[model samples]
Structure formats: C-alpha cells, structure tokens
Target chain A: SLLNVPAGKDLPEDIYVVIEIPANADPIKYEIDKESGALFVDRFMSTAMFYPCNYGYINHTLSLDGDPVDVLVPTPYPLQPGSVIRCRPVGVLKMTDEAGEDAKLVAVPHSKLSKEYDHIKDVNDLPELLKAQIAHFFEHYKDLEKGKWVKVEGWENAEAAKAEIVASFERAKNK
Target chain B: SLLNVPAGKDLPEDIYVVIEIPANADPIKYEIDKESGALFVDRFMSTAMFYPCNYGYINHTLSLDGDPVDVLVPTPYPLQPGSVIRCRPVGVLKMTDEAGEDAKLVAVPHSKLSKEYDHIKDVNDLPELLKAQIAHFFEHYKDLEKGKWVKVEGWENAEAAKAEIVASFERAKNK
Candidate 1:
C-alpha cells in the first residue's frame, strides 16, 4: 500500500452555534433585504439553542452522498444539524469542564446559531403547528446541501450563498 | 365512565433520595462518641430540586387491609441506582415552554425510585432490558398506588417512618 497526498485536507475551527435564540442578547435584524439581497447582521445579538464546542450541525457538504434529510438534535447533546453542526455535540448537555463555561456561553450573531438559526424554521420547532414549516426548511436544506450551491472556498461559502440570495432579492425588489 | 387514575402519584415535600442510600445526603462523620445514629441534615440550606406542586400516590396509606406497608416513592423514570435524580412534571414532558432549553433541570436521587428497580444491564439487550425493568418499576409503582407494602405509606403518605439502619457516625454531647 502507498500513501497519497490529498489537496483539500479538513481542519477543525473554533466556533459554537445555538439552534434557538438564547437569552443574553439584544434583538438584531438579520435577514436578506428583499430589495438589495444584501445579507447583513445587526450588532444587537440574541441567544440560540446550540452551544460552544458542540456548536450546531450543517449539511457537512460531503460529496459522498446519501439520503437527504434533516432532524432535530437528540438529548444529552448540545447541537445538531445536517452536517453543519459537525464540530459541536448536539442535544441538551453542557461541558462539565470549568474552563469551557465562559467561551461556551458568550453570544455570537446570525452566524450565531441561537440568534440566527432559531429564526429559521429548520432549527427549533417552537410551535408544534410549524411541523410543515420544518418540513419546508429541510427541503431547502437538502437542496442547498446537495446542490453544493455555494461556489466558493474558505469562509466565502456563506458569503457566496448570501450574495446569491441577495441577487434573487434584487430581482424581486426591482419588480 | 370511570376516570382511570395513574398507577403512581406525585411526591409531597420532595423526597430527596439516592442510589444506595435511602437518605441521599452525603454521609458525614463526627468527632464525637456514641449517640442515636448518623448526623444528617434533611434541609441542606442550599439550592435543591424544589417542586411547587406535585401529585403523590398515597393520599391515604391504608393498605388493602387498611394498614401501611414499607413502600418507597415510585417514578416512571428508570433510575440507575447510585445516580442522583429529582422528580416533577412526571412523565409528561412539560414543553419547557419549548423543549430542552433552560427547562428546570430537576435534580432527583435514584432512591426516590423503589430500591427494587434497576436500569443497569446488557446494553445489547435494551429492548428486553427496558421491558423487564419497566415491568418491575410498574409493578412496584402499582404497589405504591394501591398502598401495598410492609411498613410505610406511599410517597403521598409523607408521615415519618421509624428508621433503624446502622449508624455511620454517632452524635454525642458531654458536659
């Protein structure tokens, strides 16, 4: 057997996510403006369900494909997502380590899962009636993940998708 | 039509308990001589699992023969002996107002569950494990609901019991 070098090696990053808007933050406007498709984040933040270390799941965007599905995180977990929440643990748990407490609790923004994702129907199923909306969110997630629509590398993937969404917004805006 | 009462009852004055110790308070030692029994504090003067309102099994402890028996608190939860736990909200997963976030993390001691129950067993045989243990806990809970036991009343029967376990320590005073 021989070893082969791989071009894009996967490396972990430092970030946490919250599924529902957590308490510790001021309300912030975070949406793609229908007119300009401009994706922006307000300084005021909010809390979310998912947390640090066990951030939140995403599609993972693996080329190795399987069935397209999204589900709520299970218990004893801190976070859950399609593959996006890879880095974090999912469900209802907290790190017992004293050192992890602060970093885990500090709030971030739309990128902040608790704040941003909570607004998305796909994250926390607050109203039991929203099961249909959750279904729709999953459908979108599958399309986005499987389509691998974001045509960028580095951190630009999120930006890329935001830009595309903004363009769609511009068309509607001009109309 | 008859309303079917559940096989168990909520506890009164939260019966804090443990896995092996009928008394969940951590065992403490005293420097004194011979005395009544172990030095224990029912009220810790600290934050503990508190329930504002809970149902109890035995509103009355009159057994089938109108006499009391030695029955313990009964819960739907399969407590791993030695595990610390608390009880409230019963089995109905109170929607935490939502699901998991900031929901009251009620602390329960395993001893609140009957001493005869166990969740420990072969993981590979979970289906069977759950069934068997459920049967056991349920039977015990039935005994509790009907007030069937050796000396005590149901968790609802919160009257004091005469306990005579060996002393871990002796609290004594010499003038």
Candidate 2:
C-alpha cells in the first residue's frame, strides 16, 4: 500500500531494500505485485517472533526461490517499506528453502559503517559468531510453511553473492 | 525507564522480560545484579542487529553462564525492560557458551497461544523449522565477544529446562 516495486533494472551492486516485513511487526510477508506494482501482505509467520534482521530482497535479481534474491540488512533500526539501503554483500548463506537451494545474501548497511564489518569480503573473515547466527536465521525463517528444517550447507563470500545475483538474473529472464 | 525489574521472586512457570535492549535497540545486553537486584547495562553485542526475540532470562534460576538462566520470549509486541509476561516454556535450547553448557528456554506469551505449540512437550515435537532457529539464536547470539560460534547440542523438553534451573540455582547458591 505504501510503496511500489521499481520497474528499472538494478545492478548487482545496487543495494536497496524491498521490505517484506518491517522489523518489529508480526512476520507478515509483504510482496510486490509485479503487474500492478502494489505491495500486499503475502502471508504471516506461524509464530509471532520478531524478525531478527531487516528482512527484504535485493532490488533487481531473482534467486531459486523465484523472487528477488533475499537479503538481510543488518541495520540498527528498521526502515520503511521501499526504503533504499546502500549495502554490499559480505557473504551469502547457502541454504535450501521450500524450494531447493535458496541463498540469502548477508549485507551491512553502508550508511552505518563500523570497524567490525567495514572490509569483510568472505563470511569466514567475519566474526565466527555472526556467521553462525546469520546461517541460523535462514535455516529457520520459513519453518512454519515448509514444516521442515532448511538445510544450511555453508557461507560464502561477496564473489559468491555476485555469482548468485548473475545466475538469478538469468533465471528470472528465462522463466 | 518505562518499567523497572520487579522486586519479587518469580515462580518457575511465570515468565517475564528482563529486557537487555528493546525490540529495535542495538544489541546491548542488560541483566539484573544479584547483589543489588538492580538492572544494569550488562554489555553491548559486538555485532549490531535487531534482536529477533525478546531477550531476557528466567527470574530465579542461574544458567551455565552464571547469569539467570537465559530465556527467549517470542511475543509479537516488544515490551519495555521489566515488563512482566506470563508464558510457559515450549522448549529449551541446549547450547554452550564461553563458560560451558547453557540452556536458553523458549516460550510463547500466554496471551497468544496457538495449537501448533499448545501441547509441545519436546523441541522435537515442535515445527522442525522453529526448533532449528531457536537453537541457532543461542549458538550465535554472543558471536562478537566469543569470537567462535558456540555449539548447539539440541533442544529438549520442560523437564530438561527445570533440570537446568535446578543446576544453575545450586551453581549460583554455592558461589
């Protein structure tokens, strides 16, 4: 209702948020209708836990999930739907969703740069503690709908994130 | 400042929040002082992210971390520190910290009960997705300071939760 998805294509490095659910709201997913360019409540989480990260997808890429590549913005505050966040992929969680092989990119808001994450290229280069939690978030975010635990194989670097974006772009185009 | 820690002992089954940080605050940890019984800003999370759940601990028990046994309350709304929530444990995460083995209990707000968790006796009986996420939260919540990710052994029932309460109680009492 508040914002619409952009029609223009986005580069792999262009970081903007397509907010599915704001930070503290019940995990009701809001998806963009590609035809009408309207945002609608897609569904609700089975449980009422708050999203641990700023949950959204990248501006212009499709993943195996058949949606814009999912991205978790580790921002201190929640942004509104269609909030434009400048960020770059630090790592991507290699996971399986209801569909197989769903990879969610993990990025930090470029606006709020901190020493801990300023130059992280590989997920392993990040704190081992953060790497594990990020992986955990992906493995469990869809538990209610899928009824099964999503398998998280590992975490990869920015290069891997770019690779996913390129492949997803083709996937969306071919489909 | 909206609420302060209750100056009373809580029953094992009675659940409440000792809010370390509010729903959207930086991952700064807050805890109650045993001697003063006053709440203090315990520490800040090395990584900054919105807490996925209401972070707190059971009122009377000491955990393997030598703090009140930690608890993760999955409530829809984020309450201020010292907010009292009546909840029952659905499951417990068996994990390890810098200290040793720790169990973080997961519960649902009594006000918002659902059939999915109404009769959950063990974490195994819960949705496979949620069970996995709950374990992940504990295993990596302290990633920044801990450096390495903590190990999550598994999830268990209320009985295991109570056992942890008892052990942590003795651990705190004898010290």
Candidate 3:
C-alpha cells in the first residue's frame, strides 16, 4: 500500500512525498482512505482560495496529529494527485487548527524543472513574499468555516524540519 | 549620469533596473556614483549575511529616501553590477529603516532564464517560503549595527508597486 512505502533512502534531507492535491486546482479536498488505500474526496474548501502549492504527505511517517506528515512542494507547475516525487525538506510551517499541530513541511521537488530552486537549502532561502503567501493562505483558508480557525506559530529552518520528519518516521514505526 | 537615464520604455510593468550589488557577492556594498556615473563601494555589510537577490535601482525615479527607487531582481544566477536589465515588477516589500520608506520593489528579469517565473504575475504568486526568505533578509540584515533597525510592514501586489514607480518618477521629474 502507498502508506507502507518507505519514506526515502535518505531519511530527512531526501524523501518521497505523495501528492494529495495540486496547487491552483479545484477546492475539493482529497485524502487517502487508510482502510482501502484509495484516494477519496475529504471535503470541499469553504473558501475560494486554492492550495498555495502541491499538497501531499510523506509516506510511512506519522505526525503529532496522528496522521501522515503533511508536506507542501513549491513548483512552477502542479503535479497530479497520487504522484510521488522525491524532494528535499527546506523548512516547516508551524500551524495548528481543530486538529492539534497541523504543521506543513515545505520541500523543493528534485526535478529538472525545479533546478532553479536547487540553491534553496532552507526556508530562509525562499523569497519573503512567498513565505507570507503560504502562511496567509493557511491562516485564512478556514475563516469562512464556522468555529474553525488556524493559527500559524511561525517557520522553522531546514534542520528543524528534518528533525520533525525523523520523529514522524519513528512514530509511524512504533505504531 | 546613470541617474538621468529613463526609468523604462514601459511605465510600470516593463522597466529597466541598474544592478548595484550582485547576490551572494562580498559584503562590500556598491552604489552608482551620483556625480561621476561610476559604480563605487558605498560601505561594507555589518553582518555576514549577503544580499538575498540582485540589488539595484530604477533609473530616473526618486523614492521617498530621495534616491532612485530600489529594486531586487530574483534570478537563478547573480548578475554583474552596472548591468541594466529589463524586468517586470511583481510586488513591493513595505519596509522602513533609519532611512524612511526603504521599500524594495521585487521584480523578475525579462530573460529566457526567468521564463519559469513568468507565471508569477503578483507577489502572491510566489512560493510562501521564497517570500519569507526575502522578507527575513531585509528584516535582519542590519541586526549588528547599533541603533539600526528595520521594520517590514508587509508586501503589496504588483499594481501597488506600479503605482509607487509612477509616483517615484513624478518625484524625480519635479526635481
């Protein structure tokens, strides 16, 4: 099953992420059905804003929220859902909502198209406006949903993101 | 004098910028000599961090700081100082230091290398991580200097940046 796939040959720096939603796509949320290993629609986004980047999860890792660690891959173009791509962790966006600790790991896809971003070793290497846009999207995406709110704590560097991935992998292993 | 050069053939969208400092270069700051039109070292950076992007200015436009409107061009490779490149403003970083209104106009060079970023019409189109990096550099670049501080108000869209350029050009014209 996709969930049982190894995270990656390289633990944190290099890893595999499975895309669940493509950036700028329809607001329909999709998720992997744990029981059947099939992709299914979770819910429709209440707000008009779309995903800021490719939304996915690192396989074989369990985050603090008791689910696979969520990841966002910034790319010039969006990838199709269910496509697994190798990426390097650049940073993590500390966020929380109804679900506790819904942090999103930011990664750069390892592909010829993303060669320009190869120099970005950490989130700090990104443009300030880009970071704000990502945070802004997460902070306000659930605004229209009644009684639902998300708080963005801040961003952590690549080292911190890698540590989080390591712990997530351990959690999945123990479970 | 380079200061007397026209800002650009196209008012806001398509404009020319003269590079003053290349990214990842030495800590030595470079600027255009107002009287002689020669590029000269202004000062050395107090901190170890380098410029996040190519630092330059629009010709024939005076910003609130009584100088040419500063611009930051993001490209995969660092450009040589004194190189004038045609670019399109994507957004503006609302920042203020001891020198009031030291806002930076962020643009993408109109070159084959920057073709991938052609889709980014506005600052909001940038990756969240990239935006954060640019802002972080400005916010903390002068951390070591005594009594020196920088406040990042936030980012504005391309339209706002265009309006700023127009106002800057007017300021230079009336002077």
Candidate 4:
C-alpha cells in the first residue's frame, strides 16, 4: 500500500509523493483512503476555481494535523492521480486551515526525465509569478465555503521544508 | 540577424522567438536592438518584481505598435538570454499598455526535448494558476512607475494567437 511506503528511500530530502489530484482539473476533490489504500472523492471544491498544481502528500510522513504531510508539485504537464513520484523538497508554505498547522511542502520532480527543472535548486529559484500564484490558489480555494478560512503566514526556505519532512517521518514511525 | 529570420519555417503556429529576459532574474529589462541585432538593456524595471517567465519577441514579426510581437515563454529553467528558440503558440494575452494593442502571445517550447508539455495543446490545457499568474504579472509588473498603466483584456485561445502571428508576419514583410 502507498501508506506503507517509506517516506524516503535514501535521504529525507528525497521523498515519495502520492498524488491525490492532478493540476488543471475541475473542482472535484479526491484523496487517498487511509484504510483501503484507494483513491476516493473527498468533496466538491467549495470554490469555482480549479487546482493550480498537483496536490498530494508525502507517504509515511505524519504532520501535526494528524495526517500525512501535504505537498504541492507544479509542473507544465499535469501528473496522473494516484501516481507516486520521487521529489526533492524546495520550500514550505506556512499556512493554517480550520485544523491548525496545515503547512504544505513545495517540491519538484527529482528525475532525469524532467531535467529542465534542474535549475530549481530551491524555492527562490521558482518564478516570482509561480510562487505568487501558488499562494493565491491556497488562500482563495476555500473562500466561498462558509466557516472555512485559510490564513497564509508566507514562505520558508528549503532547509525548513526538509526539516519538516524529517520531523513528519519521525512522527509516522512512532505512530 | 534574428530579426531577419523567417517568422515560421512552416506553419504560422510554429515560430521562432528571441529570448531577452529569463524567469527569476532581477528586474533588469533587456530588448533586442533593432538596428544592431544585439541585446541591450532597455531599462531597469520600475517595479520591484522579477519577470515571471522567459520574455522575448517573435522573429520577423511586427505588431501594430511598430515593434516585434512580444511573447512569454514559461519554463522550469532559465533559458539563455539572446537564444532563439522554436515555439508553438498556445494563447494570447489581450493586453493594452500605455501604448495601445500591446497583446502578448504565450507559447511553449516546440521540441521533442520538452515532451512533458506535449499535452498542452491549447491555452485551456494550462493550469488555472499558471494562466492567472501570467496575467497578474503583466498587470502589476509596472505598478510602481507613474504614468504606466496596463489593462489586461483577458486570454484568447491558440487560434487567435496563431492569427495574430500571421498578421504580424505580414506586417513585418510589408515594412
């Protein structure tokens, strides 16, 4: 099962991400069922806008929110849902939802197949527009739904992102 | 010289673009010197933000504004400045700056080397966040400068973008 997969094969910075939703898709939200290890529709998006990037989580890594650490992977092409891809941590989005501490890690595909992205060594290497757009999408994705608010505290560098991943991995192991 | 190159080797949809500013760089604006066929610093950007993508102009194409038609090529890596690359038009940003009819064409690298973007056949195929970010970049990029106001009309599909390229090609030929 995907949940049983190790958080990282080698280094904590190099981790596996299980894609829950592909980019440019409609507002139908999908997630992985923890018990069944299957993909399931969570709920319809409260807003009219589609997802800005591939949304997923780091396998076997638990965050303070009592779930796997979430991640956002932006690519020119939309990845397939339920796909597990190797990724390198670049940064973290410091955010909070109804459940506190819903921070999201930003990563890029760590593969020779996507060499064009080799230049993105860190979050600052991302295009200014891309960084802003990702933040914008998260801030307003749930605006139309009542009693659901998201506060964006801003961004942290790659070191912080990797540290979070390592901490989450430890939490999952303990559980 | 790059300006002397054909607008398109075959179809108008397939054209060459001369990159001037790469994504994630400081706000130092550059442009192709028409007379010398060399890149020159146009000016430092009035705003504090960096360019959102690979910015350049189509070869041998002239827009109504008496300059080569501008284009934005978003890539994961920062392409070399003054590099002339083949591109496929996917959309047009309907924008008007202090100068009228300053519409910018959006394109992707048209090469087998970048096969990950093969699914992006049209403007709609782009992630909603990407499209919004591109538009937002242009709208706010010139914000700090006085007497500089940019109004974005919206995006037109690939067909319109191709037609604009053809129209600009003819204009360049006539000139």
Candidate 5:
C-alpha cells in the first residue's frame, strides 16, 4: 500500500506519499542529464482540487525504465516563503439561543487539529482525500441541520438564526 | 479571502484549516428548529496535517442572516474517514558511457523523495520541504552532469544535454 490516511472530521494531515516510475516506458525517455547537469522528463500528468503539487512547473527529469511520464512537483498553497499552515485554530466565535438560552459556539473549539500534511501523503489518493473532506462535512452537519444536535457556536454568525433550515442544507450540498 | 494558506517548502509542524461563507450565504439564513431541531450546514471540509494542543471532532452551526451553515469546531483527520494517494515517478534511466563509468545514474532522485511520504494527506501536492530534497539531489547531480559536459557516448542521445559551464541552468531555471 502506498498510503495510510486519517479520515472523517480531521484536517488534512498525517498522511503519506510514494512516487515510483515503472520499468518499461517509451522510445523517448527522460533521464537526468549527467553530462549537462539537468534532470529531464518527457510529459507529465497530475490532478487535484486546485491542482497537484507543482502544477505547470518545470524541473530536471531523470529517465526511469519508462513506466511513468514526467512532470515537476508543485509548491504547496498559501505560496509565500516562510508561511506555514498551522493546524491549530487562531480564534473562535460563540453564540446563544434566541429565547435568551445558553451560549454555544458556531465552530472552532479551544484547539485545532494535529498532524502534518506530509504525514497523510502515504494514506491514499491525494485528490480522493480532498473529496472525502467535502463529503465528510456533508454528513457531519446532518444532525445539526436537523437541529437534533446542539453545539456551542464559537465562530457564530449573528444572522444565522433568522433563515430556513432545509435551504441551508441544500446550499451546502452544491459547493 | 475565502482561503488563507501558508507558503510552500518550509517544513511545518501542523496544517490549520478554516472555511468562510459569504454573509449572504443561505446557510447564514437558515431558520432554527424551536422544537429541538435547527437547519445546519450539511457539509464541512477537514484536514489532519496540523492539530492543536487540544482538539477533537466537534461540529457547530451559526446563523447567517437567517441562514444556518454547519461548521465543525476543530475536527482531527484520523477519527472519521478520509483517503490517501501515491504519485509515483514516471521515468529514470541508467546507462554506461563507452568510457565505462559503471552506468551513470540518470535518475530524478525523486526516488529520494519517496521517503516521508507516509505523513502527507495527499501525494497530490508535495511541500517544498520534500520537494527541496528532490531539488537538492538534482542540484548535486546537475553538478555531476556538468562534470561530464564533454559528451561521453550515452550522453548525446538525450536532448537537454548541452556542453557548457553552467550546464543545467536551463532545466534548473526557477524550477
């Protein structure tokens, strides 16, 4: 197995990654240019929500047996140097009931998730993980949308109290 | 911005996540169920690469101008259900120059990157930390490629090969 990932509600982390080209490829093979000092690959293909790592970028390619095509590795999101994705929550918002009931949170608790994105790479298909996140969210809020469950609205929106519940569910279904 | 991501490359300890909905989002306008039921966000997005000191899988909802969008407080990645991916190498070729140099390794060294893939959420987007390792290997190999700039038999068949001082400058440019 190339990967072993976390599931459900957690953020994207503690996954795994493995890249191996096959032994038999094609006529025009890409090999790292030892004499010229450059890595080279022929054509590359990858996919993702926004894109896979190093999309549309170029890199030195080294020819394998030809089992795999070639492409460059992309940079991570929030593409700024020195910028790191901190899994913990920076803040939170809480709200109360309309009849002046107890105060609860909209979302975001005292802390945040725990795992590095690199760790989850080996778990499964990268794009599938993102898809899983979108789906997991859909199921998790089912009870809350039904109002069968109660929670503290930490990142509460003051205006959510005045709308239709079913409509909300429908909207989340789309995006 | 709806999303705020960190820069690529730096080896970060965590992966934080946040989702934003427009004030006019219907989720912000959903009606509450006075009878212990309320409309909520039917879906959510998650991650695990980054977790806080204290975190768990919790969901919450807020009123957005009457729309109720359900939100997960700080859900970790492993508890529920997620996925993984393996982006393997496409090509690599080793050949022996007539000079009989024990078959120079014309590899992408992306093989070196296969390490630590066990921690990422998706092999889709590799961070610069690991990418750097790939870059690092080529950097050294590019030098070696240059060392052989004079074109020893097996070298000329490859196109990117050019006999020059800064040999890999073209392939190594910005990538």
Candidate 6:
C-alpha cells in the first residue's frame, strides 16, 4: 500500500513521519494507514512494557525489511497516530535482530525542538550516557519472544542517515 | 486453572518458570493454564513479528500487577509453549508500562550456561553493556503502542531478585 506513495525528497531535514503508535499507548503497537488513515494493533510485546523512544517511520520509503524505514523520535512527549511531522534525522541505530539487518533512524522533531538536543548533528553529540542507553534498548527490546537479540552494529552521522533515507527511497522505487 | 497448582520453591537459584508464549511464537501471546496446562491465544500483537526471547512466569507467584510474576529466559534458543524450565534468576528488570508496575526476571538456564555468563550472580555483575542494554529495552519497549514509556526503576542483585520470588510466592499463597 505504501509503494504507490510518492518518493520523499526532503529527508534528514524535513522528512515526514507517520506515527503508528502514540506515546503512552497500551503497550500494543497500532498500525497507521497513511492513505486510509485507519489505526489497528501492529502486534504485542510485553503487557507491562512501554516504548523507549518515540517510534515511527519515514513517509514514502521502505527499508530492505519491507516496512517504512523506522524512525526514533527523541521528543519527550507522545504524539498521536497518523500525526504527520516534518523532522530532522540526527543519527541511525544500525541493528540486526530477529528481522535481519535493519536501521532505526534517530531524529529530533524539527518543528518541536528540545532545548538541549535541537542542534544535535550526530548521535555522538548526545550525552555519552544517552547514546549508550539507546543502543542498549535496541539490543534487548526483542528478547522476550524469539530469544533473539539485536546487535547494534553502530551509529551513523546525519550524512549517513540521509544516505539511508535515500537508499530506502530508491530501493522502493526500483521495486 | 492456576488455582489448582501447587506453589513452587527452590527459585532464584533453581526456579520453575511456566512458559506462556514460546520463543519464535507469532506476535500474539497464548493464554496459558498453570493448573491444567491448557494453551490458547489471549490476545494478538502483530501477525508478522515474532517474540525474540522466551517469555513465561513463576509458578504460584503474583506480582504487584496481579498476574503471575513474569520471567524472561535468556537462553540462546527457544522453548515450546507450556514447557517449564528449571532456571536461576540472575537479576530483575523493574519496569512500569500499560499494565502498571511489573518486574521481569532475567534468568539463566540452570541446565544451560553460556561461557561468559554462567556464573553471574546479579544483573550488575554482568557486563555493564549487557545490563545497560536490558534496562534500556524495558524502558522503551512499549513505545510503539502508546507514547507511554517504561521507566526502569533499577536493577536488582541476587538477594533482591530472590526477595521478589518469595514475595510473589507468598502473595499467591494467600489467594
């Protein structure tokens, strides 16, 4: 359904994100329809767990895994599903979990800036503690179901993050 | 059906964990019977995604959330539904998500040991990276569903972990 959407041009700067699950949700991911704008459960993890960061995806793009290249919003609060926002990519968490090789883009809300993180150009710019913690979160997030763990290959710079955006965008185009 | 089971001891060092959803299970969780050992779907999360770790509970123990105390088995493989493991608790992940306050016990197979972690006494004694990643995992895991996130209260040593085992066990004993 997302294949027909137009290829996104302005990414890592002003890219659009579609929130599938809002912050403070019921610990069940709700899938969002970009075209029809419907919401439903994506799947379940633990009943008592909450999302570690704001999670969504770049509009009009798909990764090798077939979903929109996933994005992790660093904003402090939750946004509703189907909420479209133009954001800036700051870094990427390169990981291989049960789903195979995948990357989770880390972005700051371009429109809603955090006083401290609004100017982050790379993941390294964040506190060492914060970067380390985020990597840790991804590595173990999937540990409860398949006995699989994510190996965070590394973090990427904004330039590389933009490269990720375009590669997924082009891959989807060629397909 | 849990009402029919006998309370279990020998936990922490050697505990009985009742498997509810097996590793490699579909995104949905199966309703499990602690008494009769029945199995069925209690709900669904995602049809496509799979659980990465073995998820289950301690027999005859009820946590603050009112369910049996949850356990996360970190073996390198998957176990079948309704399969119970005689494991040892290495540490506890204190988290709160959609279901309220909960603790996920990190256990190692008393029967199976990894070369690096076979003798870990608490979550803290493990690699700093491992403990950090797990804390990060529990804190943000539920982000996709609602914006609500998990706040890992702290990691627990073996003594604290054992305290949880006995508390839940005693709580369920009266009920």
Measured with DockQ on alpha carbons, how good is candidate 3? 0.02
Model 4 spans > 4 angstroms off: B1-175
Estimate candidate 4's alpha-carbon lDDT, on a 0 to 1 scale: 0.80
TM-score for each model? 0.19, 0.56, 0.50, 0.52, 0.17, 0.49
lDDT tens readout by residue for model 1, B27-60: 2211111132222333322223222211122212
What fraction of the correct interface contacts does each predicted structure contain?
0.00, 0.00, 0.00, 0.00, 0.00, 0.00
Q: List lDDT for all candidates, in order.
A: 0.23, 0.62, 0.82, 0.80, 0.22, 0.67
User: Which structure among the candidates has the greatest DockQ?
Assistant: 2
Per residue, candidate 2 scores C-alpha lDDT tens digits across A1-175 of: 2234441234555455566656655556777675665777787664324555677776556665567787777666677865656676777878765556767787775635444456665666766765655665555555445456689888788888877777876776787
Q: Ranking by DockQ, best first? A: 2, 6, 4, 3, 5, 1
Candidate 1 chain B: worst-modelled 10 consecutive residues by lDDT: B164-173
lDDT of 2 by residue, B16-85 (tens): 5455545544556777566776678877655433555677765555555556767776655677765655
State, as a TM-score between 0 and 1, how close model 6 is to the true structure: 0.49
Best candidate (score: TM-score)? 2
Better of 2 and 6 by DockQ: 2
Estimate, for each residue in B1-175, the C-alpha lDDT of model 4 and write its tens digit: 7667666666576788889998767568998898898889988764434566799988787788888888988776889889877889898999888878678888888864487678888889987766766776677666556788898899899999989988888887787
Candidate 5 lDDT by residue in tens digits, B1-175:
1011111111111211122222112212122232433233433322112211111110121122222111111111111111011122111112333233221111111222233233433222334453333323222322333333222222221122111101222222333
Q: For residue B169, what is the lDDT in candidate 1?
A: 8
lDDT (C-alpha) at residue B133 in model 2? 53
What's the lDDT for residue A74 in model 5?
Answer: 24
lDDT of 6 by residue, B87-142 (tens): 77888877767667667877777745345456666786666654554565455434
Candidate 1 per-residue lDDT, tens place, A9-110, comes to 221122222232211222321222122222222112222211112222122211112211111332233332112222222111112121221101111222
Candidate 1 regions exceeding 4 Å error are A1-86, A89-175, B1-12, B20-71, B87-157, B162-175
